[PDB]
Design an enzyme around this catalytic site. Structure first.
Site, PDB file in Angstrom:
ATOM      1  N   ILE A  21       0.802  -1.001  -0.191  1.00 33.87           N
ATOM      2  CA  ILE A  21       0.244  -0.247   0.117  1.00 33.87           C
ATOM      3  C   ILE A  21       0.994   1.193   0.064  1.00 33.87           C
ATOM      4  O   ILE A  21       0.337   2.359  -0.061  1.00 33.87           O
ATOM      5  CB  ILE A  21      -0.975   0.004   1.292  1.00 33.87           C
ATOM      6  CG1 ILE A  21      -0.082  -0.039   2.552  1.00 33.87           C
ATOM      7  CG2 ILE A  21      -1.915  -1.232   1.076  1.00 33.87           C
ATOM      8  CD1 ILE A  21      -0.933   0.260   3.676  1.00 33.87           C
ATOM      9  N   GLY A  22       2.204   1.095   0.346  1.00 32.00           N
ATOM     10  CA  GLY A  22       3.223   1.971   0.141  1.00 32.00           C
ATOM     11  C   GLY A  22       4.529   1.699   0.501  1.00 32.00           C
ATOM     12  O   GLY A  22       4.973   0.658   1.298  1.00 32.00           O
ATOM     13  N   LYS A  23       5.346   2.705   0.176  1.00 30.75           N
ATOM     14  CA  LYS A  23       6.605   2.839   0.646  1.00 30.75           C
ATOM     15  C   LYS A  23       6.826   3.648   1.884  1.00 30.75           C
ATOM     16  O   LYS A  23       6.474   4.840   1.766  1.00 30.75           O
ATOM     17  CB  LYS A  23       7.869   3.330  -0.429  1.00 30.75           C
ATOM     18  CG  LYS A  23       8.936   3.894   0.084  1.00 30.75           C
ATOM     19  CD  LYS A  23       9.703   4.365  -1.078  1.00 30.75           C
ATOM     20  CE  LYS A  23      10.102   3.334  -2.254  1.00 30.75           C
ATOM     21  NZ  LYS A  23      10.460   3.968  -3.450  1.00 30.75           N
ATOM     22  N   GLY A  24       7.535   3.282   3.062  1.00 27.77           N
ATOM     23  CA  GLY A  24       7.407   4.027   4.318  1.00 27.77           C
ATOM     24  C   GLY A  24       8.751   4.663   4.503  1.00 27.77           C
ATOM     25  O   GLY A  24       9.485   5.005   3.690  1.00 27.77           O
ATOM     26  N   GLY A  27      11.976   0.807   4.328  1.00 29.80           N
ATOM     27  CA  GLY A  27      11.406  -0.287   3.767  1.00 29.80           C
ATOM     28  C   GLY A  27       9.910  -0.111   3.196  1.00 29.80           C
ATOM     29  O   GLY A  27       9.597   1.051   3.237  1.00 29.80           O
ATOM     30  N   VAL A  29       5.533  -0.845   2.968  1.00 35.57           N
ATOM     31  CA  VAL A  29       4.241  -0.967   3.928  1.00 35.57           C
ATOM     32  C   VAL A  29       3.265  -1.729   3.092  1.00 35.57           C
ATOM     33  O   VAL A  29       3.069  -1.648   2.099  1.00 35.57           O
ATOM     34  CB  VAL A  29       3.520   0.450   4.241  1.00 35.57           C
ATOM     35  CG1 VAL A  29       2.626   0.216   5.114  1.00 35.57           C
ATOM     36  CG2 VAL A  29       4.707   1.208   4.831  1.00 35.57           C
ATOM     37  N   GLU A  91      -1.551   0.364  13.040  1.00 32.13           N
ATOM     38  CA  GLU A  91      -2.940   0.555  12.645  1.00 32.13           C
ATOM     39  C   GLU A  91      -3.315   0.753  11.313  1.00 32.13           C
ATOM     40  O   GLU A  91      -2.474   1.495  10.808  1.00 32.13           O
ATOM     41  CB  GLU A  91      -3.409   1.828  13.376  1.00 32.13           C
ATOM     42  CG  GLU A  91      -4.795   2.258  13.294  1.00 32.13           C
ATOM     43  CD  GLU A  91      -5.355   3.449  14.208  1.00 32.13           C
ATOM     44  OE1 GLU A  91      -6.615   3.441  14.466  1.00 32.13           O
ATOM     45  OE2 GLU A  91      -4.284   4.102  14.562  1.00 32.13           O
ATOM     46  N   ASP A 135       7.721  15.990  10.272  1.00 34.34           N
ATOM     47  CA  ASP A 135       7.431  15.551   8.606  1.00 34.34           C
ATOM     48  C   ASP A 135       6.043  16.015   8.253  1.00 34.34           C
ATOM     49  O   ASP A 135       5.358  15.016   7.731  1.00 34.34           O
ATOM     50  CB  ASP A 135       8.252  14.318   8.526  1.00 34.34           C
ATOM     51  CG  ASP A 135       8.243  13.866   6.926  1.00 34.34           C
ATOM     52  OD1 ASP A 135       8.378  14.766   6.001  1.00 34.34           O
ATOM     53  OD2 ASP A 135       8.367  12.712   6.496  1.00 34.34           O
TER      54      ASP A 135
HETATM   55  C1  34W Z   1      -4.551  -2.670  -3.984  1.00 32.26           C
HETATM   56  C2  34W Z   1      -5.342  -1.531  -2.955  1.00 32.26           C
HETATM   57  O1  34W Z   1      -6.044  -0.966  -3.455  1.00 32.26           O
HETATM   58  N1  34W Z   1      -4.748  -1.156  -1.893  1.00 32.26           N
HETATM   59  C3  34W Z   1      -5.087  -0.098  -1.230  1.00 32.26           C
HETATM   60  C4  34W Z   1      -4.405   1.130  -1.339  1.00 32.26           C
HETATM   61  O2  34W Z   1      -3.332   0.948  -2.215  1.00 32.26           O
HETATM   62  N2  34W Z   1      -4.747   2.507  -0.728  1.00 32.26           N
HETATM   63  C5  34W Z   1      -5.559   2.507   0.360  1.00 32.26           C
HETATM   64  C6  34W Z   1      -6.309   3.704  -0.302  1.00 32.26           C
HETATM   65  C7  34W Z   1      -5.248   4.766  -0.834  1.00 32.26           C
HETATM   66  C8  34W Z   1      -4.047   3.694  -0.722  1.00 32.26           C
HETATM   67  C9  34W Z   1      -3.667   3.597   0.782  1.00 32.26           C
HETATM   68  C10 34W Z   1      -2.297   4.181   1.207  1.00 32.26           C
HETATM   69  C11 34W Z   1      -2.327   3.718   2.539  1.00 32.26           C
HETATM   70  C12 34W Z   1      -3.556   3.241   3.512  1.00 32.26           C
HETATM   71  N3  34W Z   1      -3.415   2.913   4.785  1.00 32.26           N
HETATM   72  C13 34W Z   1      -2.267   3.157   5.620  1.00 32.26           C
HETATM   73  N4  34W Z   1      -2.542   2.807   7.002  1.00 32.26           N
HETATM   74  C14 34W Z   1      -1.497   2.804   7.939  1.00 32.26           C
HETATM   75  C15 34W Z   1      -0.302   3.408   7.483  1.00 32.26           C
HETATM   76  C16 34W Z   1       0.698   3.338   8.392  1.00 32.26           C
HETATM   77  F1  34W Z   1       1.714   2.309   8.126  1.00 32.26           F
HETATM   78  F2  34W Z   1       1.197   4.546   8.674  1.00 32.26           F
HETATM   79  F3  34W Z   1       0.468   3.035   9.637  1.00 32.26           F
HETATM   80  C17 34W Z   1       0.070   3.462   6.037  1.00 32.26           C
HETATM   81  N5  34W Z   1       1.319   3.861   5.785  1.00 32.26           N
HETATM   82  C18 34W Z   1       1.545   3.898   4.415  1.00 32.26           C
HETATM   83  C19 34W Z   1       3.068   4.256   4.167  1.00 32.26           C
HETATM   84  C20 34W Z   1       2.768   5.301   2.776  1.00 32.26           C
HETATM   85  C21 34W Z   1       1.422   5.485   3.682  1.00 32.26           C
HETATM   86  N6  34W Z   1      -1.059   3.463   5.151  1.00 32.26           N
HETATM   87  C22 34W Z   1      -4.426   2.825   2.756  1.00 32.26           C
HETATM   88  C23 34W Z   1      -4.593   2.714   1.342  1.00 32.26           C
END
Ligand code: 34W
Length: 289
Positions: A21-24, A27, A29, A91, A135
């Site tokens: 769902i992301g790069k943090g 590493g 995420v 979370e 940040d």
């Molecule tokens: C395949 C798919 O659709 N996946 C969901 C997705 O890609 N999402 C959903 C909606 C936009 C994007 C997205 C980004 C972040 C989250 N949620 C989330 N929750 C907690 C953290 C936490 F790790 F900070 F706790 C986090 N961190 C990521 C690192 C970049 C933001 N992201 C949910 C989503």
């Protein structure tokens, strides 16, 4: 390491790792399921072999997270070692970041006010704990599927004490960094208030000031230029909220607690439940493509 689990616990068993769902901060995420509760979580995975000058920062991040108990800070559930990889269980915020929620199109001033009010609640909590986020930006502002707004990524978060009433370290994301942080002058929580101001412009216009330029230019642009102002057809209370944050003199910036009473916030902010409309919009948008 706070929350470090029994090293015999195997997180690949306790958790179903789903899509990235992301790069943090360090590493990557992932979305994941807790296999005991079936609650969804966020999993940050860091390779310790592929470190290092980060592990102090990883220690520091987790320490800071574990010391925060607020509806406005992402909850930290514990950490697991699996061979060389550290699994940090967080979370899960299903709405994504405010920056994601911008991709379908502009926010209205009610949504901006609401999101800023909730960030101010987070900043007030943190600053009352002598912590500094350092940040603050839209990408680090997350929403639950219910529209709750929380602060994330304490990768460079600072701590103040009796000894250190002030910090000097060069950290943050250039476009959002306060002039005194870029100059490495002694600074405190007012640095976050400058970042909040840049974030307010980001929330209103989609990008921070100077977003076209190379990040190295802002290293002199920000300390030697007049601060940015919110240009465009936005309300006068929104423009003054921005200017109140974006003063080169840190003692001229309000506290988080004061900005919660700012007229832009009071007149325009509504209940966070309404932010679900913004998440529903993102869904519909992401359906197409
Ligand atoms: C395949 C798919 O659709 N996946 C969901 C997705 O890609 N999402 C959903 C909606 C936009 C994007 C997205 C980004 C972040 C989250 N949620 C989330 N929750 C907690 C953290 C936490 F790790 F900070 F706790 C986090 N961190 C990521 C690192 C970049 C933001 N992201 C949910 C989503």
């Amino acid at each position: 390491l706070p929350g470090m689990q029994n090293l015999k616990a195997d997180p690949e068993e306790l958790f179903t790792k789903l899509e990235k769902i992301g790069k943090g901060s360090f590493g990557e995420v992932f979305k994941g399921i807790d296999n005991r509760t079936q609650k969804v979580v966020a999993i940050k995975i860091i390779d310790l072999e592929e470190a290092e000058d980060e592990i102090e920062d990883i220690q520091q991040e987790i320490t800071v997270l574990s010391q925060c108990d607020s509806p406005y800070v992402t909850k930290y559930y514990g950490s697991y070692l699996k061979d060389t990889k550290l699994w940090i269980i967080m979370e899960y915020l299903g709405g994504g970041s405010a920056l994601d929620l911008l991709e379908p199109g502009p926010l209205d001033e009610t949504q901006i006010a609401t999101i800023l009010r909730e960030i101010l609640k987070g900043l007030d909590y943190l600053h009352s704990e002598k912590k500094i986020h350092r940040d603050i930006k839209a990408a680090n502002v997350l929403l639950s599927e219910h529209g709750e707004v929380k602060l994330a990524d304490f990768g460079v978060a600072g701590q103040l004490t009796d000894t250190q009433i002030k910090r000097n370290t060069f950290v943050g994301t250039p476009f959002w960094m306060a002039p005194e942080v870029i100059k490495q002058s002694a600074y405190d929580s007012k640095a976050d208030i400058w970042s909040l101001g840049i974030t307010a412009i980001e929330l209103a216009r989609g990008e921070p000031p100077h977003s076209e330029l190379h990040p190295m230019k802002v290293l002199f642009l920000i300390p030697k230029n007049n601060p940015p102002t919110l240009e465009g057809n936005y309300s006068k209370p929104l423009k003054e909220f921005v200017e109140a944050c974006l003063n080169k003199e840190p003692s001229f910036r309000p506290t988080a607690k004061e900005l919660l009473k700012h007229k832009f916030i009071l007149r325009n902010a509504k209940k966070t439940s309404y932010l679900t409309e913004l998440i529903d919009r993102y869904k519909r948008w992401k359906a197409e493509q």
